[PDB]
Each structure stands twice: as C-alpha cells, then as structure tokens.
Amino acid sequence: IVTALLSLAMGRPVRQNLAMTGEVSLTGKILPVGGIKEKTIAAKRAGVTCIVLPAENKKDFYDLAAFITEGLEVHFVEHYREIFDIAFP
C-alpha cells in the first residue's frame, strides 16, 4: 500500500512486473508471513518476476522445490527503505 501511495505521489508508474507482499510495523521493518507456497505459485502463474519478501522467511523460501523457484529473483529486505529504492531505481 505504501508503495502504491508513493507511486501516486511522484506519479511514476511502479516498475513493470514487480509484485510484493509482507507486513510493515510503522518504521519500515518488514515482518514474516505464512503460506509462502501459495503466493509463490501464484506469482509464478502471473508471470511477475521480481518478488520481494521479508528476510525472516528466507529459510522457508528455500524449502520449496527448485523448479517452483525457477526464474524469479527474490530480494529479501528488512527495512522498508530498500524496497523504496527498488521500486524506484
């Protein structure tokens, strides 16, 4: 949502084909979230290719089958600002 708002602010479209998720706790800290397999397969199904996830779920992202994780560049992050750099290169 914050990235959405920011895109409205600058008016820059968000970078094409860049999904993202995770929770944020009022100071840019990212937080873990469950259910990773469903989001993984869905993002793969939609063709989006720059998913960014909380660092805390790193382990859980790597427990998935290699073929499922083929072709999409995870960028783990802990403080929200890095995502702000990424959405707006």
Partner 1 sequence: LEKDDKDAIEEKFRERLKELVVPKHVMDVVDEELSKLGLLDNHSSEFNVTRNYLDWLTSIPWGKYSNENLDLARAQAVLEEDHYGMEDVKKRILEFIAVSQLRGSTQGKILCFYGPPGVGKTSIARSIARALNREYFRFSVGGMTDVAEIKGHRRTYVGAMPGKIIQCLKKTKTENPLILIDEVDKIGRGYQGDPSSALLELLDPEQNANFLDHYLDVPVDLSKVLFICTANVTDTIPEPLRDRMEMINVSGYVAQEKLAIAERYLVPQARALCGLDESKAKLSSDVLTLLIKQYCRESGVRNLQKQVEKVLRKSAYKIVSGEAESVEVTPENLQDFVGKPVFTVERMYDV
| Beta carbons of 1 and 28 less than 8 angstroms apart | no
Find the shortest distance in angstroms from Cβ 81 to partner 1. Answer: 26
Contacts with partner 1 in 41-70 (CB under 8 A)? Answer: 41, 45-46, 65, 67-68
From candidates 1, 8, 13, 85, binder to partner 1 by CB under 8 A: 13
Residue 31 engages partner 1 in binding (rule: CB under 8 A): no
Measure the CA–CA gap between 22 and 24, rounded to whole angstroms.
Answer: 7
- Which region holds residue 37: left if phi is over 0, alpha if psi is between -120 and 50, else beta? alpha
Measure the CA–CA gap between 4 and 14, rounded to whole angstroms.
Answer: 8
> Which are the catalytic amino acids?
39
Q: Point out which residues bind partner 1 (CB under 8 A).
A: 13, 16, 37, 41, 45-46, 65, 67-68
